[PDB]
């Protein structure tokens, strides 16, 4: 469903720049990474589609869950 | 209450020489590290769990237990509570990325990730690769997914080449039945009934590859405290190359870490 990470191509180091690509399609920025060229966002299906078609965007992947490995 | 695990990896060999992890910064990326603990020293930390702002409150118990095991191996290490999992023990890939990036920015020496997922993330791979490129020793639990015939069951981020993947043995050096397997497995450490610190000033036993990983993170801290100029590459190589062979490498990797041999 709704939680994603959006990977960017070069030249989008600034959070304002990443956020513009996301917010203009109506997505909501959750966090811009510092070293990784990506940002977390909440996105509806249309936003995901438009992002996958945006030349700025390297990938859109689910922001999946990782868990403590105690048994 | 201290894991039998400390002696099993030969950590007291380093302590006997006068090295206990002094000045080494270890980031514990977990559910926080509880402030309730009299002995547990925590140098600092930060939370990346939106609904849980205090990295010094551990509402799960995992992070405090892992932290205690690091210090049991390396009593003088500086621990940082990097809260990337919430009370239920889960966290989003992006929270974990935020913790790794915090560790890089704050010049941590060692990252411990006693966490896993069956699937990877390109952004998480980028994060761990960047941490290793910047010189950080990155250690993860291999996973608790047992066997699946001939298939790898190693979880991410342990499955990424840049990350040391740590399986679990018991006090007899037998692989724990839950311990994940595969060619990505690097080394083993004690992970069955490990006694360590729990929230509320408690002590108690837990099992899992989450318990094995901190023995290797602490081992890395011991080695760096003796050899502050060795690179992460050199630390990793030392631990892998000098491990005690324990059986078939699909199940045991290079075998059990031996910090005595590694810190030559
Ligand atoms: Zn000792
Ligand atoms: Zn205590
Ligand atoms: Zn690996
Ligand atoms: Zn040296
Ligand atoms: Zn075999």
From Swiss-Prot, chain A:
Residues making up the propeptide: 1-62
The protein's superkingdom reads Bacteria
Q: Where is the Inhibitor I9 domain?
A: 3-62
Which biotechnological use is given in the entry?
Used as a detergent protease. Sold under the name Alcalase by Novozymes.
The cellular location(s) given in this protein's UniProt record come to:
Secreted
Under the subunit heading, UniProt states: Monomer.
- What family is this? Belongs to the peptidase S8 family.
The misc remark on file is:
Secretion of subtilisin is associated with onset of sporulation, and many mutations which block sporulation at early stages affect expression levels of subtilisin. However, subtilisin is not necessary for normal sporulation.
According to its UniProt entry, what is the function of this protein?
A: Subtilisin is an extracellular alkaline serine protease, it catalyzes the hydrolysis of proteins and peptide amides. Has a high substrate specificity to fibrin.
What name does this protein carry? Subtilisin BPN'
Q: What is the lineage of its organism?
A: Bacteria, Bacillati, Bacillota, Bacilli, Bacillales
Encoding gene (name):
apr
Q: Which residues of the full protein are shown?
A: 37 to 100 of 382
